[PDB]
Design an enzyme around this catalytic site. Structure first.
Site, mmCIF file in Angstrom:
data_model
loop_
_atom_site.group_PDB
_atom_site.id
_atom_site.type_symbol
_atom_site.label_atom_id
_atom_site.label_comp_id
_atom_site.label_asym_id
_atom_site.label_seq_id
_atom_site.Cartn_x
_atom_site.Cartn_y
_atom_site.Cartn_z
ATOM 1 N N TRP D 136 0.879 -1.361 -0.126
ATOM 2 C CA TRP D 136 -0.038 -0.133 -0.030
ATOM 3 C C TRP D 136 0.952 1.190 0.068
ATOM 4 C CZ3 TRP D 136 -4.594 1.272 -1.637
ATOM 5 C CH2 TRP D 136 -5.013 2.684 -1.468
ATOM 6 N N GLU D 208 7.590 -1.552 3.224
ATOM 7 C CA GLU D 208 7.019 -0.986 4.503
ATOM 8 C C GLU D 208 7.560 -2.090 5.528
ATOM 9 O OE1 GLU D 208 2.726 -1.700 2.739
ATOM 10 O OE2 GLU D 208 2.043 -0.419 4.555
ATOM 11 N N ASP D 241 8.867 2.692 3.341
ATOM 12 C CA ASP D 241 8.007 3.498 3.584
ATOM 13 C C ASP D 241 7.213 3.305 5.112
ATOM 14 O OD1 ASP D 241 5.333 4.592 3.430
ATOM 15 O OD2 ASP D 241 4.604 3.681 1.855
ATOM 16 N N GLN D 244 3.087 4.514 8.234
ATOM 17 C CA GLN D 244 2.382 4.173 9.294
ATOM 18 C C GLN D 244 3.073 3.748 10.488
ATOM 19 O OE1 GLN D 244 -1.404 2.428 9.079
ATOM 20 N NE2 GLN D 244 -1.292 2.353 6.741
ATOM 21 N N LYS D 270 1.827 10.029 7.143
ATOM 22 C CA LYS D 270 0.599 9.936 8.351
ATOM 23 C C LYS D 270 0.788 10.460 9.566
ATOM 24 C CE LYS D 270 -2.451 6.424 5.909
ATOM 25 N NZ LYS D 270 -1.628 5.641 4.645
ATOM 26 N N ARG D 404 -7.346 -3.626 12.456
ATOM 27 C CA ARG D 404 -6.201 -2.846 12.468
ATOM 28 C C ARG D 404 -6.211 -2.091 13.728
ATOM 29 N NH1 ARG D 404 -4.201 0.039 6.940
ATOM 30 N NH2 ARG D 404 -6.429 0.687 7.112
#
Ligand SMILES: *Cc1c(COP(=O)(O)O)cnc(C)c1O
Ligand SMILES: *Cc1c(COP(=O)(O)O)cnc(C)c1O
Ligand SMILES: *Cc1c(COP(=O)(O)O)cnc(C)c1O
Ligand SMILES: *Cc1c(COP(=O)(O)O)cnc(C)c1O
Ligand SMILES: [Li+]
Ligand SMILES: [Li+]
Ligand SMILES: [Li+]
Ligand SMILES: [Li+]
Ligand code: NA
Ligand code: NA
Ligand code: NA
Ligand code: NA
EC number: 4.1.1.64
Lengths: 431, 431, 431, 431
Positions: D136, D208, D241, D244, D270, D404
């Site tokens: 993502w 990620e 990345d 999050q 974010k 999540r």
């Protein structure tokens, strides 16, 4: 009779349709400038089959060489050399302009164009290819991405990096500068756009000297020279596809010889094989050296095979020996004058273009409006056939249908005359 | 002598190098299972040239048919049908499994694969093609994007939408499920990934029954059936490339016949022409109907030409008539047992695989480590040549060099024996 | 002083250079139409920052709303609605032309263009995007593939299916029909080419009403209408990027309102946020319904966030309430007349174009030759800065450097005058 | 009430649906770990909005800094530097590992990933990007081509050169070596395939540390190190990345700090903005130098804007000052133990994974079969909401729905407890 029921049954049940529509005859034999049906009827092949049979059907020399070789040397492992391959390669180096020294012997036009495109990408490190919006380079892969005359729709995305520019068309000019069709200014205009979309990876430009599938469109005077200049400035190779023009058809051994611009890579095919599958690329030693240092690879089942090479050599010997290139100018002059006369007779004939024995006749509603004639072409073709004259017409968007005329280089005066005669009759019958 | 200075001069100056390195001999004549040099030396062609010469060099029947046709019917306009084309198409429909009814007659393997890929894209409306990571489908365009055994590097981006999965390789398994090489689980694992990257446009899967360039890798039992199931579930066509396996070489007319899975499209080439350029695609009537309704087009200079078709027909007649498919099992059994014996003698021989007369011998440092032998292969090949045995080795990353053996289907017991003998001697000489 | 050693140290060591060259000042505060340096010097922001600050710096209403919301409602899970989002969406539907009913609230111009391009691909099922050769739509992905004003080189292939046409440029016309720049004929000429390269998957056309990055190029009269007609005929959506023109800058709420052509999708950004990151797409209910049925998805961290939406609403209220769109015509008239006067004074000023408060001044060697002035622009800019006037110039191939002028809509008469005055002085100083 | 007819009218008529389905409440205010509806009902935000609000809603420090800056320094021309930009860039250099020195301040995660991908292509000269099959990275362009968790279908071809490998998933292992899930062998297996399809232009790998959208999948021990080794061997950059995971959420300032592998480029977003749009890339000086020499360009309307930068700085100061990273371990430990207890109670809970305050709970039919629970997830979510607990579930093919969980780093013990309590009740209510 051509009306064999089993034959036709079998054809409807077992053949894949690939475009067009099968003529309703059964060809049984071919000789010189004619094909014969099951009834024995002689049809004058004014297209040389699929524009290939430069020496006509079943030429005895060809027959004779196919013969010697089929029983002596046929097909070999790619790494094994033989005399016909080396002799053909040498021959090609000698009769093409200086600067063209090394050859690769293959089987088809598309293979030839691929081999060329691959070398150009390797050697330059880039990948964007530029071609004409009316081009025809073949159906396989890269050649196909460079082909804009047909087959772009419905089959998924083309190769990444493909651009096209409009081809100079004198009959229906669309770019004007100071009141006149300025085809060089058009060229400049087109390149500027390219330059804007490129990602900075221009590798080559692929062109035909006379766009065949595109409607027999000849690149005008000074065009090629400017084209080559555009390429040089951008570090791009210029690949010339002479599948239809090479081997004497337009009156010079190679069309590039008329303009005096020698390309970086030259590809040949239809006319080299004279009906058989033989093709080739010819490049400069410098380019070949580099491609080699870079690891260039191009394997095909039939690269460097003896039989086909033997045949191509014999084709060149005949063309040279019999002065067929010259004949092409003389016969071409004969045919052209006749077509002009037709044009005197019928207003439907809007243009007569082409060079040597590679001629196009654009049929139009009316000579002034230049409106494409809707359906007349097909009539005409139909009548021709009935009259015994094999023709081929092409229809492109925005243009009148075009008759591609291209008889054998061995065509006789009589056959030229006969053809002209049947053509007249068919048109008269069609209106 | 093979040491002709002019010959070699001319070859260095005028030939484009396309991969590999020219053998240092001048082949002058070929006959049956042998090629002869300028000194007259006979070399046993254990590769059938470039894996094509299924009936050997210059087979008299072929010689005879090339003959009849070259002087009678040679090349024709694409829209004109003739008897050899219709007879060959019909023949192909009849000897391939039920479900394969319609044929397209072309010139090369790459053309064949392109034609197939194009139809599959048209018919499905999608464009993503899946192939094996060790595939070989040809050098032109789409075929090339589907080719992963070589030529991917240095030539710019491949066709958009190309994916590859690993091919099942029993000799060096890498996917285990519960302690065993589970090739079907591998298949599932590979597809899942595909499914994740697809944009939802899976159109076809192209595969070889026995990966030739890839190292003579045979798809194991039950594989093909599962493959076809994977395709069906996703609305994808399954295209089988039998360029090397078709026409009796593995002991069945078509390899697909062994597994009992009939593909959606079948392509043939090398062995169909027996040395000449002839190729073809065979599909179901349903698929052909649809492609036609959709406007499918595939033009080539030599589609449906009489001469090549005549030849292919004669090839099938011979194979059928002389029971060459059976012979392939018998001779294949002979060769295989001999290769096994060699393997008894020399530890360098790590594997003997393949089927019928399409055999592979993987050379390795040591039978347990299975370490690829660095440089031995080339020695061996060298010695072979010296001994008069033409061989071909392939080397892929992660694998030991592999000898591709594939003599003519007309090969004799003696020739099999001779070959086995020279092979032994060359290996002994090489260590 | 602006000469803070630590500051500059830290800037050289820790900032990634992204184009251009940092001004050598430290901006410390901003207010209305001015920014102030560390020395307190006031610099007249004639670009509204990066062409966004439509209400000037730190407008009290904006200050006040950022305030209320930052402490009340800030950021929420994408599926949670709030009043500012719904109010902004409704507001946008009401002030854009009929036909534009539904909005998507995002953060940047590139996001906005992506969202739009994605919808257009979904809804049409096609994927080819057409844009101008001088466009600027953003740096991320699709927006970037559609961007031709800069950044195409050195970063690998662009998105598959990207085409570009030349934009109508009246100042340096290049397409003539009967002695006159015929921009509609150009349009026809460009589309024909497109049509030739498309694979039959034209999905949309993305355009700016006034090409900003491209050199302040205004689409001439009747252009947009013809453009939209070209799209309709091909089943393509017309996406209008009003990042710089929207929200009153050219004298109408939206530039599309002047021409009377309403696009299929409208995107907004720079001026909507007035300095903050807020962006949006506005489409018709029909298109939205369809995209929804098709499963359209577009998630971003900040889609539908309260704070930014609150701000955009307040921006619209101010613009409406204070009659800023009208003011743009009045002030724009003032600025334009002054620039014309400059042009009377200095031969280097070759053109004054643009609309409302979105003006361009093309600097040239000489008014007749229209030769681009090499280096003068930069002088001028330099002097401006020294004089306290923030300017921005753009230089495109084939054009003279262009000054992008675009003060706040709240700019005062005095500030317009001051600016005009400093501009004159800088030019005089630069020659 | 949440049942405002006008509100809902307006929402149905004027909002573009972008995925999911709007909750049926009107959020009116937010504070700390809760959001409130129109009825005043408090809902516990266990997702931190869209996983961003690391300090909770409307944190007073943030409120206060947004305040100072909105009235002092807001938005500036890209070439003008200010103190908050330089201070934030410096700060980022200092708190990220050695080797990460230079920053670029942007607005969104997708922008950040694009900027990174562009630099990596420039610097390496190559263009192929590799990512995870469950990644993502955002919806715009390149980020989108690298995104495999959703949005690949129906929108046309992805960027040329995109490959994906499977991500290590311990809960549902699929690659075994000697009886055990061997994730490093999987890695080797995946790369080999890549290597086979690459055209020789591998530029980077984007990953990620903990796949969020992909189902809260943590890269196992030793993975990252091997990954980075794979990249080094191929001359590829490794881009991490941390949208999050960055900024304390998993218990370390940056997730990369746990593994000790520092990437070539690090992207944040974010959590950096804590709810506002702020993003950034951090690279080494060497890479930045090179990209600069190469002409790297990345313009956005809001690059280097003061306001957002000011905010990000304040976020870092708070996190540092209040020891929020540590708190994340303590609170995370609290939440995790509670989730484990739930798992003791209900067989539907198949797994509890994640790190710090970034936790995932995989719901399954049955703990042994590990069959994904069809529809239960949605029930549970529904009940939660009714109970006042905001949750988010994700459902991927082949996996059970995943919750999540990711509360604010400022979350209190009580809130953790409350949440655990409502979660239990909702599950009990759902079966
Ligand atoms: C026919 C042709 C080709 C391709 O030759 P094939 O044998 O059809 O593959 C390429 N270029 C031109 C100009 C042609 O006329
Ligand atoms: C040789 C081969 C091809 C291509 O045939 P060419 O004549 O080289 O174009 C395609 N597929 C396989 C499996 C082949 O062995
Ligand atoms: C600035 C701009 C964009 C992109 O906006 P960003 O915030 O930079 O992503 C798109 N289109 C136009 C016409 C622009 O001026
Ligand atoms: C959210 C996210 C992004 C993109 O951020 P946006 O603001 O949505 O553009 C990129 N990567 C990861 C891992 C994300 O979670
Ligand atoms: Li050969
Ligand atoms: Li033919
Ligand atoms: Li939100
Ligand atoms: Li800024
Ligand atoms: Na020459
Ligand atoms: Na059959
Ligand atoms: Na409207
Ligand atoms: Na650091």
């Amino acid at each position: 009779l051509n009306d064999d029921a089993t034959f036709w049954r079998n054809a409807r049940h077992h053949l894949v349709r690939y475009g067009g529509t099968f003529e309703p005859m059964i060809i049984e034999r071919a000789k010189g400038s004619f094909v014969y049906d099951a009834d024995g009827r002689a049809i004058l092949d004014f297209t040389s089959g699929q524009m290939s049979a430069v020496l006509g059907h079943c030429h005895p020399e060809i027959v004779s060489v196919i013969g010697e070789y089929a029983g002596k040397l046929d097909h070999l492992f790619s790494g094994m050399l033989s005399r016909p391959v080396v002799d053909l390669a040498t021959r090609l180096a000698n009769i093409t302009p200086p600067g063209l020294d090394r050859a690769l012997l293959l089987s088809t036009g598309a293979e030839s164009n691929e081999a060329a495109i691959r070398m150009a990408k390797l050697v330059t490190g880039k990948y964007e290819i530029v071609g004409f919006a009316q081009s025809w380079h073949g159906m396989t892969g890269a050649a196909a991405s460079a082909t804009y005359s047909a087959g772009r729709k419905g089959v998924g995305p083309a190769a990444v990096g493909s651009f096209a520019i409009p081809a100079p068309f004198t009959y229906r000019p669309r770019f004007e500068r100071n009141g006149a069709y300025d085809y060089l200014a058009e060229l400049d205009y087109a390149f500027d756009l390219i330059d804007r979309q490129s990602s900075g990876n221009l590798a080559a430009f692929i062109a035909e000297p006379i766009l065949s599938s595109g409607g027999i469109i000849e690149l005008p005077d000074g065009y090629m020279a400017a084209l080559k200049r555009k390429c040089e400035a951008r570090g791009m190779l210029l690949i010339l596809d002479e599948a239809q023009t090479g081997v004497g058809r337009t009156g010079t051994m190679f069309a590039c010889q008329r303009d005096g611009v020698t390309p970086d890579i030259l590809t040949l095919s239809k006319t080299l094989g004279a009906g058989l599958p033989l093709a080739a690329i010819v490049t400069s030693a410098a380019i070949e050296e580099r491609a080699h240092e870079l690891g260039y690879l191009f394997y095909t089942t039939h690269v460097s095979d003896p039989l086909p090479a033997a045949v191509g050599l014999r084709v060149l010997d005949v063309v040279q020996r019999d002065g067929l290139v010259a004949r092409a100018n003389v016969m071409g002059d004969r045919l052209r004058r006749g077509l002009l006369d037709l044009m005197e007779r019928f207003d439907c004939i809007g243009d007569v273009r082409g060079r040597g024995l590679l001629l196009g006749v654009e049929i139009v509603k009316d000579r002034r409006t230049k409106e494409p004639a809707d359906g007349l072409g097909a009539k005409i073709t139909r009548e021709c056939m009935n009259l015994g004259l094999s023709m081929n017409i092409v229809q492109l968007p925005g243009m009148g249908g075009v008759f591609r005329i291209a008889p054998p280089l061995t065509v006789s005066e009589d056959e030229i005359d006969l053809g002209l005669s049947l053509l007249g009759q068919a048109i008269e019958r069609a209106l």
